[PDB]
Design a protein around this nucleic acid. Structure first.
Length: 803
RNA sequence: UUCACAGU
RNA sequence: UCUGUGAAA
């Protein structure tokens, strides 16, 4: 429970496919970096001014200390140098005057790049983290000051108007990653909304829709002024009549020709003076547009007013405000390019890159290749999908997609008793709408092998979440064992949360919500997917993996776990699900409420205990193996999460029986990264987005130099560029081969019951996500109060309500 | 709240 | 959480 296993071997399954990865080979020396800690006071100033302070500190004491060395800075306390500094362990104290700060700097440690080279080779088993971090600081130093940092991406002005004084800025993500033999620089592109570096007058011309400012010869109306105010308030501006930056707190009601302030004269006496007057006398600036209001800057009652024609919107402030759908449309154009388009963008960026010409990068003897890394991937064979009925039809996924035509559920549920609760206006969702929807739904359901062989025994209109529980209870007594309540919803509303709370937690009634728009106008696809959900919620089995096509791990009892934690931007929600049959199709769910933004699953031992117990209840077997798919953890959390959670799983096992120790395979699933894969050959591109084919597997060249990880793109890219899921094996008692684990994961991506498609992550993980989200919906109304708020009814525990 | 994918 | 695309020829 300490060190992740080494890669057992390399996969050879599937067919080869030529790929390009947005990893760029790095040339890294074997010298020793010197790591110093900086303690600068005052310590609460922003990062970029820290970088300015450090920079001036460096170029000031050149004769004395730093000399020819160009140190890099992470923006906080960490400094790195290629050559040693005239330093000891003792903190040396300096003072730097910025156009005054104390700067304490001491020697921390030597960072060996030789040991890193060893880690890339077969010399060392582990990759030293502070080497990677140091390298990252080296590569990020200059672009942190030259560009505008958003998150860990660097953004800049294009060469892209958005309207409303807003524009698209283009940026790139950059990160140093360890790979086999060589270090890699992962680069991706992105775009976001910024405010233009234009004069405030141009800004009002764009916000108030003026071609020329001469359009408004008269003062602004209250409406105009209010819109402009709510658009510019909070934004920083800079003056052009001296320089100084100000933050706008309000816009004056009065125009500059009438807005007054208490002018403090040389005598010490105050006299009320208009802004226009002051700018005419003091700055000899006759305002060309005195009929416009002023920007109130500074704070509160300091009466600092700036006329519009002397202010510019400062560059580098991203627009977080929601945008117009036109602006959002062009935004979509920019941010979600097709795979070849993104490929070409990255390629262009790196063919015109600044890394090799960066003085700080060259100081540490680093070089970066211009071309993407050529990688050979493997497209895995998709599993066949077995259905039921008399035909027992078998579907073959083509490009990660199949359908239900001429196919019936492996185990369809006969729906005898069901009701309809319409929370939409009757005059808007009429009776004939409900009737037509009903007969069409019955047609589709009968075709799918889930026969709704009768009209609803109940069908009423309603309004108010407060009406949900009294009705549902009424439905629970009036009608002997209904199976389903279909609830029609008029868009986003609290009654959905209430319906799920009442149905799942307090009564144990299966409920299926349908939005109003999908009742008025229905499509066979929508009805079919709806039937997938309904059949699953009633205990049915939509389909199974072809038994003979399963990997040999299924020759012995095995449980598949999925785990996820969702956090508030207010407790965190942990969810763990587990397989309950050998197909594997049906899953049981457990969920806990826990500490605010705690990523470690606190009550994992108990949850796993419950799941194992339920597994034995369902299969009459104890699992010989436990496959644990953990979602949403970063590498920085790997050791902690692995430690506590693997100990928790083993704890559950040993607290169930004395000598019961099944093999545990701990696998982290991550969809949030910047790895992009492209088809080298144009004829391998799939669809209009031109993405790699579903089942594309990569476990070479860009993966970890020693540990057991791989990329799997199991889904078909519909729009933009696909995001291949990454899998990192933190533990493996079962000694999986790469092929078997990759194939297993891929097949598990075909067991997701809400669609006849291969999804991006294995069904366990996805289900865990769904469970956590549902729990979030259960908490809409004390720690243990919240705990029993997410605890489902007894008649729900053995169900797949989260579907 | 038919669903998946993709952006933030 | 929102936003977008997709389930013509």
């Amino acid at each position: 429970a300490f060190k992740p296993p080494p890669r057992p071997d390399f996969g050879t399954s599937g067919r080869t496919i030529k790929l390009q990865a947005n990893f760029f080979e790095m040339d890294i020396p074997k010298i020793d970096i010197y790591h110093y800690e900086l303690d600068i006071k005052p310590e609460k100033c922003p990062r970029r001014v820290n970088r300015e302070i450090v920079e001036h500190m460096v170029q000031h004491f050149k004769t004395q200390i730093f000399g020819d060395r160009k140190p890099v800075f992470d923006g906080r306390k960490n400094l790195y140098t290629a050559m040693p500094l005239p330093i000891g362990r003792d903190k040396v104290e300096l003072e730097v005057t910025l156009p005054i700060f104390k700067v304490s700097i001491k020697w921390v440690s030597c960072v060996s790049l030789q040991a890193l080279h060893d880690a890339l080779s077969g010399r060392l088993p582990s990759v030293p983290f502070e080497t990677i971090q140091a390298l990252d600081v080296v590569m990020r130093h200059l672009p942190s000051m030259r560009y505008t940092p958003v998150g860990r991406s660097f953004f800049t002005a294009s060469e892209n108007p958005l309207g409303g004084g807003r524009e698209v800025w283009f940026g790139f993500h950059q990160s140093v990653r360890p790979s086999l033999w060589k270090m890699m620089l992962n680069i991706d592109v992105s775009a976001t909304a910024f405010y233009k570096a234009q004069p405030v007058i141009e800004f009002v011309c764009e916000v108030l829709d003026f071609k020329s400012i001469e359009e408004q010869q008269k003062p602004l109306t209250d409406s105009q002024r209010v819109k402009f105010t709510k658009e510019i308030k909070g934004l920083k501006v800079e003056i052009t009549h001296c320089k100084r930056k100000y933050r706008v707190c309000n816009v004056t009601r009065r125009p500059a020709s009438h807005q007054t302030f208490p002018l403090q004269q040389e005598s010490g006496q105050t006299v009320e003076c208009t802004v226009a007057q002051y700018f005419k006398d003091r700055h000899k600036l006759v305002l060309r547009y005195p009929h416009l209001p002023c920007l109130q800057v500074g704070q509160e009652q300091k009466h600092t007013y700036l006329p519009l024609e002397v202010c510019n919107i400062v560059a580098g402030q991203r627009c977080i405000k929601k945008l117009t759908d036109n602006q959002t449309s062009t935004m979509i154009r920019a941010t979600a390019r097709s795979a070849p388009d993104r490929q070409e963008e990255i390629s262009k960026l790196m063919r015109s890159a600044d890394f090799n010409t960066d003085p700080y990068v060259r100081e540490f003897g680093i070089m970066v290749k211009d071309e993407m890394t050529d990688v050979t991937g493997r497209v895995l064979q998709p599993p066949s999908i077995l259905y039921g009925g008399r035909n027992k039809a078998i579907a073959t996924p083509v490009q990660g997609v199949w359908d239900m035509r001429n196919k019936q559920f492996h185990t369809g549920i006969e729906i005898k008793v069901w009701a309809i609760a319409c929370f939409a206006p009757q005059r808007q969702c009429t009776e004939v709408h409900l009737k037509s929807f009903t007969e069409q739904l019955r047609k589709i359901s009968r075709d799918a092998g889930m026969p709704i062989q009768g009209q609803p025994c109940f069908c009423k209109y309603a309004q108010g979440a407060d009406s949900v529980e009294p009705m549902f209870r009424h439905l629970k007594n009036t009608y002997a064992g209904l199976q389903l309540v279909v609830v029609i919803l008029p868009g986003k509303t609290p009654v959905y949360a209430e319906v799920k709370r009442v149905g799942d937690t307090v009564l144990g009634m299966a409920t299926q919500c349908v939005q109003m728009k999908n009742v008025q106008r229905t499509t066979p696809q929508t009805l079919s997917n709806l039937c997938l959900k309904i059949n699953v919620k009633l205990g049915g089995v939509n389909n199974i993996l072809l038994p003979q096509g399963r990997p040999p791990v299924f020759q012995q009892p095995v449980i598949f776990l999925g785990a996820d934690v969702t956090h508030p931007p207010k407790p965190s929600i942990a969810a763990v699900v587990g397989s309950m049959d050998a197909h594997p199709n049906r899953y049981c769910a457990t969920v806990r409420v826990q500490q605010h933004r705690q990523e470690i699953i606190q009550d994992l031992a108990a949850m796993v205990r419950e799941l194992l117990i339920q597994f034995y209840k369902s299969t009459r077997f104890k699992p010989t193996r436990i496959i644990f798919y953990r979602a949403g953890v970063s590498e920085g959390q790997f050791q902690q999460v692995l430690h506590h959670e693997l100990l928790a799983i083993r704890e559950a096992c040993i607290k169930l029986e004395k000598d019961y120790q099944p093999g545990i395979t701990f696998i982290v699933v991550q969809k949030r990264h910047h790895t992009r894969l492209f088809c080298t050959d144009k004829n391998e591109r799939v669809g209009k987005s031109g993405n790699i084919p579903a089942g594309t597997t990569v476990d070479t060249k860009i993966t970890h130099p020693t540990e057991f990880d791989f990329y799997l793109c199991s889904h078909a890219g519909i729009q933009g560029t696909s995001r291949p899921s990454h899998y990192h094996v933190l533990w493996d008692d079962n000694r999986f081969s790469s092929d078997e684990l990759q194939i297993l994961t891929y097949q598990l991506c075909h067991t997701y019951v809400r669609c006849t498609r291969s999804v991006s992550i294995p069904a366990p993980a996805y289900y865990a996500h769904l469970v956590a989200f549902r729990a979030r919906y259960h908490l809409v109304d004390d720690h243990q109060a919240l705990a029993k708020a997410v605890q489902v009814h007894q008649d729900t525990l053995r169900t797949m309500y989260f579907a």
